[PDB]
Structure 1
Amino acid sequence: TFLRWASEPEHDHRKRMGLKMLMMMGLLLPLVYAMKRHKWSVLKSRKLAYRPPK
């Protein structure tokens, strides 16, 4: 365990930052995904029609 600390002195802090980034990403990915869906709904719901006068 001491050698593990010696090789990775940032182990604990790395895990802490990883937990924080996991929380932030789990919060952000749905939010930015919702923003993308909001912007793209104009095209996703659009309905095209073809009306040749003939």
Structure 2
Amino acid sequence: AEPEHDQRKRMGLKMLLISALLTSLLYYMKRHKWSVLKSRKMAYRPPK
């Protein structure tokens, strides 16, 4: 019924490893850029 069975699961593997590796990196990159807004501080200084 599914001759591909094997190759398809060998693929599923490579997929997770890469997927894991890549999602990690991209999370860092996303965090790294947003860091500028995340840390960011602000004050209201009317000229009272």
TM-score bin, normalised by smaller chain: over 0.9
Give the aligned CA root-mean-square deviation in angstroms: 0.5
Asked which structure has the greater CA Rg, the reply is 1
Segments of structure 1 that go 5 or more residues without pairing to the other structure are 1-6
Segments of structure 2 that go 5 or more residues without pairing to the other structure are none
TM-score (norm 1): 0.85
Percent identity over the alignment is 77
TM-score (norm 2): 0.95
Runs of 4+ in 1 over 3 A off after TM superposition: none
How many residue pairs end up in the alignment?
48
Q: Looking at both structures, which has the greater relative contact order when contacts are Cα pairs under 8 Å and sequence separation is at least 6?
A: 1
